[PDB]
């Protein structure tokens, strides 16, 4: 469960409420302790359930973090027929 | 954190080039739908 407020709540912009500043306990290297975390999420990733929110996907599926070291830039791929084709 | 001001993500598309692009698309669509029809473009109606 996330406890969130709006990021830059006094800002005049089109992005007024688009980024939410959420607080949560999560956990850490040792199973007996928890590390409180403050992070920013976009409105489209966080759904209401300080106000209480959850990540939009916790009602549908598991979330896997993409590796930060692997680029998403498209690279040309060629398709080659096997011999006989 | 956001350093500086919070700014909206956006895309820049030249208006003249796009308008010419659609004019070309409309001519090619008219070749299949009739020279005297009216072709209209609209935003996506719904879904995810």
């Amino acid at each position: 469960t996330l406890q969130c407020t709006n990021y830059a709540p006094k800002l005049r912009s089109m992005m007024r409420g688009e980024i939410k500043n959420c607080s949560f306990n999560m956990t850490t290297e040792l199973r007996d302790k928890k590390q409180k975390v403050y992070s920013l999420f976009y409105r489209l990733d966080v759904v209401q359930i300080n106000k209480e929110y959850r990540l939009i996907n916790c009602n549908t599926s598991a979330i896997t973090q993409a590796c930060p070291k692997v680029s998403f830039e498209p690279i040309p791929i060629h398709y080659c027929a096997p011999a006989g084709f | 954190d956001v350093l500086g001001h919070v700014r909206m993500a956006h895309c820049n598309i030249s208006k003249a080039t796009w308008n010419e692009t659609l004019g070309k698309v409309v001519k090619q669509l008219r070749k299949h739908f009739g020279n005297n029809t009216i072709i209209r473009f609209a935003q996506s109606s719904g879904g995810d």
Partner: antibody
Amino acid sequence: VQLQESGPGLVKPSETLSLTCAVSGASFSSFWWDWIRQPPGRGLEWIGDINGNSGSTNYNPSLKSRVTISKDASKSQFSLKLTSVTAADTAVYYCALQSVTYYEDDSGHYETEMAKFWGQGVLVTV
Amino acid sequence: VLTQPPSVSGAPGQRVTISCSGSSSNIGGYHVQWYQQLPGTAPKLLIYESNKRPSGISDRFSASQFGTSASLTITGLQSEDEADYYCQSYDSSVSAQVFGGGTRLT
């Protein structure tokens, strides 16, 4: 950054009042500019503003029907045109930098330190 | 629309505060700027965000905002500090930037 206000001194009742402000080192197109006035011995009233890029305007609803604000990026000038002027509605007029404007957001009004760059103003009588 | 004190006393060595009181449509949801002026001179701002100051303003001035009200604190009254103070904010009900009536410091 400097701003120099200029305009008429005594304007007769029902005549048009027109003021212009020029700025130096602040790029005109990068900021929102506004007009503020106060009679001597009285508080301040916001008149309206300009989006330095798009030309979009905003006016104080109590003044709106009698006030037009315009800009010219050439020569970095900002102008205010007020009609149906009366002695009850005169004041010392000022221009100030109001906020940062971005091309992607015509309603930005982004807060900035640069808003401190106020001119000294002119006294308008009627 | 943002109210301010009619005037305000103070002394060297004692904090002096100036308040503004508005609503959720003007102070509660928007930044409040603080200005200081002397008679015959244009105003200059002291605080450009609810908390942030320009690099040209001394540390004697600070401010905070809570709910639909805000307050400017002066850490001690100097003879050169007496001035007419104003707060400003954008009022989304009016759809205009709104000034308080200001206060006169003596």
